[PDB]
Symmetry: C3
């Protein structure tokens, strides 16, 4: 009986969660909320957590095979260099956005009864080294997001080199495997949309609790982050796209004139993908060559989400702050590096980057298996659909921009 | 040098195990049996244990893709509804069969020196929740039958939805994967028949011991179960099939008249599969439409083993009773739910349902990694080929019945 | 990266140049400068190999087992696998007796944890056999467990083939696409070998910049001792094993080498059993051998049938035993024979294949690479690998040309 505008569907359980919560954080005892409504956001949280392991790894084998030299011609060398440098700046700017806003801190929580401890971050030599997983199976098997990453990328570059192989038997294998890995990837996102369908219930319970148990003080903080994000996203559009459209030859204000339909679709769809027969239509409607908008636009569909990278920058900081954790330089620029990858393999479905955030949380020090960490995560997971729209939308823009700059080079 | 009627082959080591045992549980010291002949049933037990994990999972991804809406047309909606409601009643009736007989209890054993403890079955909220595996890889990797299941069925439903996909790249992946997962499944059953070949040795040692060390008191108890099963199987045939054949239009006593050859083959083959060019032949020799007996008969080959579902009902109870464990309501109707699935993905080979029993043992509270549990399992594993015949046979009948009732609807 | 040279000479450069930056800094300077600074670079190397060890035991053996599996090979190949299996089996026997003559390692006595290597107590036979049917195959791979992993590979790869014999199509296509996927893991995994093998000069540099830094000059001999124990076993294999049965059948054994010159030298410098196949099959035709005979056997001997590796894995397991202070027992003696047969059977035939695959046979005698001491002794002999890899690679290639010629006479 449940099938509605799947974005409005959430926004309904969200403004209506905040309200069933807030009041039962008065008249009633939110240990009625705690015992009864809470397990439902938990069923939600977990269902995502599930996907986090397959879809880090499955994704990155695929996505790594997407860029791998020598697997892309020089028409695509001159676009990946763009994609990589653009989405890297985006997280830099997400860090500096959430460095301006203190999104979270003062939302101080300590769920175990004890405040989050950071287990002692060890000698550099070991921390680097300790990421070549000694048994890659083990890595996936239990947890280990980092090695699991290094092992995906390593495989995914190898995978491609076997398609270059002078041998047939070797190539058909190499392929059928790369195929099977994708399809895991895909089927795994199919499960995302699965859970995303449970999402209204889940998101209901999630801020029926942030409102129930964090008082009204969270409301601001949740907004503070939204602000930190959007005002960074449009700070990205202005200080980052318009900045280099002007550098090359494309009239930057009129760029938006033709690219209107794409971005709005990207916004309300909350799916970088959904907006591609809208993006490529727009792409043709601005001089762009058949072969150029055929490579780049549907490759920027998955790889190249500046909107996600900035998101995962401000999200990692919202968790740091939540816990009571000084996110250190170094682990600063880890966020830059890890949210680049974290973006690179973020689906471009509905709630992709919220799951993929785990990867970058995990890599700075905050493992989702840590009551405190996974509390601060369960919170920002509640205002995700609200970020997912500006997010999705920039992600789509960033492909139209790069397509246009490299169009000028050809 | 060993190649005989592979069913008579076992029944030889079985009546000749019970005899080498029983006597060496007198004149000689069955700590000669314990040290010398026993490791040979163990090599057997383990070899099955091995398969249990791949073939729960590989099976259920495949088998879930077999039913998954929307993957089956309404000709098969009107048969799966049958299959699911029939095999469900079968375990209900298996529970009530072994509720009448006390198959096991008084076979009280305590192998660790200590009697089986049940580790404390925790808060409902957690027990449900705690089956969305947090890392699917982990789940399989170490043990975890339940989540492993949930994740199978969740994947296999997703898998199918990608074949519905408007995209080609997406469908070919989705396929090659679903292909690879099968073939695991298959190659895994190939290993079953492997082990099943060692089985005569294995089954020899198994009741050369139940006879050596349990006294003669077991002999009855082993029969008690056989009784509890067969008199449940033919109680199924009479009170369940004849009951609804009479409800629709098919003359129920004459149904058996044409279906003779199928059932006997099913009996001696001990392979639901072997009996399909025999089942479909009989299916044509009773008015059934080419398209109807083409869908349902070879789909009832794997899915829809009323005979297995009942088996796993009475087996779970034989272990409960063996240990000294009151199998509780709830975990009662768990057995109903779990042995439905446990049946749904039971191979339809030789010794399929014996392995797949673990899945349903495991799910009530008795994990095969618990000396006591896996002692009670190693015993009933010895009279498996004796059940496997009545079992196999009903499984085959249940497809011919459903085919005939849904034939009347068309 | 600017780094692309004769990839074998490339290593031999960082090796004679490691030994020299090491040796001296084990005087003037304090090799706790070496220890803190240059050492992690060999470790990045060691680890990168270790990575591969698990996939490429398993992926390899599923494939390789499907290579032999009856009934998957006709009687033209029955009469060659029987050769291959008996030849490579004797090779490790001869590797054991080579390193039984030389004491390669011992007196290189090390105890890294501060404590000397303990052997954890090798349990009742019944359990030790039994305990190799992995109870959860996933578990096995997942965490470590080389032996079961193997048993489970070989068990699958035999089954895999049986499904291709299947009267059913749906059953065969699956069976295949899977057996395809598993290969390609296999293959992609060895692509990663060559990857690491490219880092190798750095890695090998650091590795004996240390064995030279911290083991004094005493190691230098010991490292050579092994090389000796290997080569003088390899050419003891050629003379006492090949020439011995070429003379038994009909082929003039000294003139055999006359036509097979080009193949062996290529095999030597390539350090790649595979690279030397359009060289091996060319020579194979230039000695009467039938089109159908040298088409089956030579490129099947490419991967399966590395006498040169089997002997290597024999002397290597002994170099580790000796290093630690471990009496390698009979039983675990003939384990080495059995395990280095398989260990060879699925050794890639790439560059540094058999060094990785050694882990499989170390692991199966009692020395698990997860044991500081064990994986110290391993990191050492890993440094003089490219030096062995040449004689090794080369014999591996010879042994296919021999078997091809003997079974040629039978046809
Ligand atoms: N919302 C983004 C992906 C993400 O969730 O980060 C998109 O689909 O475009
Ligand atoms: N014996 C059944 C399956 C099972 O063992 O439960 C059949 O093959 O029909
Ligand atoms: N060097 C051998 C394989 C090995 O390293 O053992 C070859 O490629 O022929
Ligand atoms: Hg919150
Ligand atoms: Hg018994
Ligand atoms: Hg050394
Ligand atoms: Na995008
Ligand atoms: Na992405
Ligand atoms: Na059936
Ligand atoms: Na079944
Ligand atoms: Na070879
Ligand atoms: Na080999």
């Amino acid at each position: 009986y449940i099938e509605y505008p799947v974005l409005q569907k959430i926004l309904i359980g969200l403004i209506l969660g905040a309200i069933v919560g807030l009041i039962l954080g008065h008249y009633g005892y939110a240990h009625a909320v705690h015992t009864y409504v809470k397990p439902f956001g938990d069923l939600f949280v977990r269902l995502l957590k599930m996907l986090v392991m397959p879809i880090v790894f499955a994704s990155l084998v695929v996505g790594a095979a997407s860029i791998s030299p020598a697997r892309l011609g020089r028409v695509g060398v001159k676009i990946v260099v763009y994609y990589l440098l653009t989405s890297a700046f985006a997280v830099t700017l997400g860090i500096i956005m959430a460095r301006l806003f203190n999104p979270g801190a003062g939302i101080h929580l300590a769920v175990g009864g004890q405040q989050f401890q950071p287990h002692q971050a060890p000698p550099l030599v070991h921390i680097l080294l300790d990421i070549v997983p000694t048994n890659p199976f083990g890595a996936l098997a239990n947890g280990q997001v980092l090695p699991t990453i290094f092992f995906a990328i390593i495989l995914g570059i190898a995978i491609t080199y076997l398609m270059n192989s002078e041998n047939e038997k070797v190539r058909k294998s190499a392929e059928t495997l790369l195929d099977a890995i994708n399809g895991l990837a895909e089927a795994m996102y199919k499960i995302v949309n699965g859970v995303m369908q449970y999402a209204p219930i889940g998101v209901f319970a999630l801020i029926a609790y942030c409102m129930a148990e964090q008082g009204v003080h969270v409301v601001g903080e949740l907004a503070k982050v939204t602000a930190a994000v959007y005002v960074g996203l449009t700070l990205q559009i202005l200080l980052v796209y318009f900045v280099l459209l002007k550098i090359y030859g494309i009239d930057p204000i009129s760029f938006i004139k033709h690219a209107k339909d794409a971005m709005l679709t990207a916004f309300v769809t909350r799916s970088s993908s959904g907006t591609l027969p809208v993006t490529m239509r727009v792409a043709k409607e601005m001089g762009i060559s058949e072969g150029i908008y055929s490579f780049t636009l549907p490759l920027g569909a998955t790889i190249n989400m500046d909107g996600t990278a900035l998101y995962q920058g401000v999200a990692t900081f919202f968790i740091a702050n939540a816990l009571g954790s000084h996110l250190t330089v170094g682990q600063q620029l880890t966020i830059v590096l890890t949210a680049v990858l974290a973006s690179i393999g973020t689906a471009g479905v509905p709630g992709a980057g919220a799951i993929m955030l785990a990867m970058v949380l995990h890599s700075v020090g905050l493992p989702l298996t840590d009551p405190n960490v996974a509390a601060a995560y369960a919170c920002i997971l509640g205002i995700d659909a609200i970020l997912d729209m500006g997010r999705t939308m920039v992600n789509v823009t960033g492909d139209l921009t790069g397509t246009a700059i490299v169009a000028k080079t050809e």
